[PDB]
Amino acid sequence: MTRLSEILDQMTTVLNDLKTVMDAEQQQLSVGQINGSQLQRITEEKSSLLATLDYLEQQRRLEQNAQRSANDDIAERWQAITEKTQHLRDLNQHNGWLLEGQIERNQQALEVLKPHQEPTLYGADGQTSVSHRGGKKISIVLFQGPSAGLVPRGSGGIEGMAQHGALETLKDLAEKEVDDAARLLGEMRRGCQQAEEQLKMLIDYQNEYRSNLN
């Protein structure tokens, strides 16, 4: 009766850091302002800390074979994990919604700055509203931005139009909109995908652990 105590302690402390990290990025996605240096450091922390959760997770199952409970320490850590992983999975679902919403918002913004050169509608304004699960559409703009939705806080999304202008040569500001958003929000989209997946599955199998009585 040991080892799990350390692993689950390492999980829960990383989940405290991920509480701060994943909530902080989620905030900057829902405000609508994507901060480059800030989100780069935040998502770097998230993805490293998730890789850590992942190694501790697979090893935890190896320690469900190697060790078991008969210990309250492991049990306190266990409850701390299920709580934090649940809250993280929830705000992560919201985080991914904010991403795909802010990414598609970016692609309509690119449509508005870009001149209509091929048979499209118009770079109009709009204030749509969406607050359910979904997102992930085709690449709306000529850049790789396959996302959909809107940030519920930033209620000002344009109609779900898509161009087909697959030709380019020189950009300036639009390239930095795609660079900053599609790269940062992309690494958070893939990172958060892995996050909510491993966290919901964590909790799912986690009931396998018994209290001190075993």
Side-chain angles (χ1 to χ4, degrees):
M1 301 63 177
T2 184
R3 294 171 59 130
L4 273 178
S5 50
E6 178 190 272
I7 293 176
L8 305 186
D9 192 84
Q10 183 64 91
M11 286 293 294
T12 192
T13 187
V14 167
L15 294 171
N16 184 93
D17 280 76
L18 282 172
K19 184 65 269 304
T20 306
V21 164
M22 298 170 59
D23 192 280
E25 54 183 82
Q26 184 278 95
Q27 181 64 90
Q28 305 306 92
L29 307 172
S30 52
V31 302
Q33 178 181 88
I34 302 306
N35 300 88
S37 175
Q38 184 60 89
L39 291 181
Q40 190 172 213
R41 297 178 63 226
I42 298 176
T43 190
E44 182 63 84
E45 294 304 278
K46 182 185 61 277
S47 302
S48 177
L49 291 176
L50 294 174
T52 307
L53 297 187
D54 179 74
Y55 106 78
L56 293 162
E57 169 189 276
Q58 62 183 30
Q59 184 183 29
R60 181 198 312 231
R61 175 168 54 235
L62 301 178
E63 304 311 315
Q64 292 185 29
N65 177 268
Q67 297 294 269
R68 64 282 183 154
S69 50
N71 187 216
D72 306 284
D73 292 271
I74 307 179
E76 298 171 288
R77 301 298 78 179
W78 179 82
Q79 299 178 213
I81 292 172
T82 50
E83 292 177 290
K84 276 65 189 184
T85 57
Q86 180 177 212
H87 292 119
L88 288 181
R89 190 277 167 267
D90 180 69
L91 64 81
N92 190 98
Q93 186 58 88
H94 183 223
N95 180 317
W97 179 245
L98 297 172
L99 288 174
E100 301 182 312
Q102 193 67 216
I103 295 171
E104 183 178 69
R105 190 284 311 148
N106 176 87
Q107 315 320 330
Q108 277 83 92
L110 298 175
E111 180 62 41
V112 169
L113 277 299
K114 147 265 183 175
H116 59 83
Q117 57 169 329
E118 33 59 83
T120 185
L121 298 309
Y122 185 74
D125 301 281
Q127 296 181 330
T128 59
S129 186
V130 284
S131 301
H132 295 109
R133 281 69 167 145
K136 58 282 294 166
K137 199 184 297 171
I138 61 178
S139 49
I140 306 307
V141 73
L142 70 160
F143 306 91
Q144 295 182 211
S147 298
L150 178 63
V151 295
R153 188 271 180 91
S155 302
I158 305 173
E159 178 58 70
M161 302 178 183
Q163 59 173 269
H164 55 95
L167 69 169
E168 52 176 55
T169 171
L170 77 175
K171 303 72 170 284
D172 56 292
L173 291 175
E175 189 62 79
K176 273 56 182 61
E177 298 306 286
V178 178
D179 178 54
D180 193 68
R183 283 62 189 261
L184 292 176
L185 308 199
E187 301 301 85
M188 285 185 283
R189 189 179 181 208
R190 303 174 65 86
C192 294
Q193 175 189 148
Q194 170 67 333
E196 62 174 63
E197 179 56 43
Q198 70 176 147
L199 299 174
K200 63 84 182 173
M201 186 203 65
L202 271 170
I203 305 171
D204 188 84
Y205 77 79
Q206 215 53 220
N207 62 327
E208 190 60 81
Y209 179 70
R210 299 287 177 102
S211 62
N212 188 335
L213 185 59
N214 184 215

